[PDB]
């Protein structure tokens, strides 16, 4: 008996914000008033941003693999 | 007997916002009033944003194999 | 009897923010007033942020084998 | 003027295993092999319970007023 | 002017398995073999078992009310 | 002006397992062989138990009022 099983093999993920390119993207202008406002539960307001964001709760990877020979 | 199985596989994925290019991507005019109000519960307010998000919960990647001789 | 298997095989993951290129990402102009505000819970207000953030809770990454000859 | 509103009002939830009567509930005879078995991925056996469960992600109760007197 | 509105009212859920009666509900007699099983994936098997259960997401209960006088 | 609102009002919730009776709920009898399992991930077996179990994520309870005089 001869058992020579090969294994040469890739497995991969990429999660991503990823080989961008971002050439002068330029802010605006943003005015805001506000006056004799009540709030009264939980707020998260957010002004004037430019943000790049990434959350990849996900792109995990698993790999199982099993020999036997029995005689 | 010879067993000689070859893998020269490859299993991927990618999830993403990727490669973008982005050239110039000009901010607007954003002008805002608010007078006088009244929030009872949750408030998430967002203004003259220009983001980019990502999430990827997914992208996830599983592989499994077995091998048996029996004699 | 000759057991003579080959791994010779690779798992890989990327998450991320990456490979990226920014250039001259100007910011804009930001003006805000606030007169007599009430807020009765919690708040978290941000303002001309420019941010990059990844946070990335995923992307583990497993591997198991098993090898058994009886005889 | 004379401004005398009245609530004498109930407001209720019941969300339950509530009020039950269980006389004499007996269990009864289980058994069992398992012989040789492979799992490649997560389990929840369960054997021979018996069981009393509650879960209630529910069962919430609000109530808003409002009052206005202008001259 | 004499604003004098009675609310004398009653608002209700039950959400449930409730006011039940059981009587004696003896359980049976159960056998399970099992021989070289495989399983690839999530598995909840459950045996014997003679439960009570309840989920309730639900049985939420709302109010709302206004009154004005304007002169 | 007699501004003179009156609030006698309740607001309740009940999430549970609650008001009842268990008269001499007894056991059976389990029997469990198990022989050369595998198991290559999680794992939580659960034998002969029992139980009475509540969670309740629920059963939040919330009240708001607001009054005006204006003159």
């Given at each position: 008996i001869v058992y020579?099983?090969?294994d040469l093999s890739k497995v991969?993920?990429?999660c991503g914000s990823l080989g961008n390119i971002h050439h002068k993207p330029g802010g605006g202008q943003v005015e805001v008033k506000?006056?004799?406002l009540d709030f009264?539960?939980?707020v998260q307001?957010?002004?004037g941003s430019l943000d790049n964001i990434t959350?990849?709760?996900g792109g995990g990877?698993?790999?199982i693999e099993t020999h036997?020979?029995?005689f």
């Open positions: 020579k099983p090969v991969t993920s990429k506000s006056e004799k009264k539960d939980r307001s957010k002004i959350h990849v709760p990877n698993k790999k036997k020979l029995t």
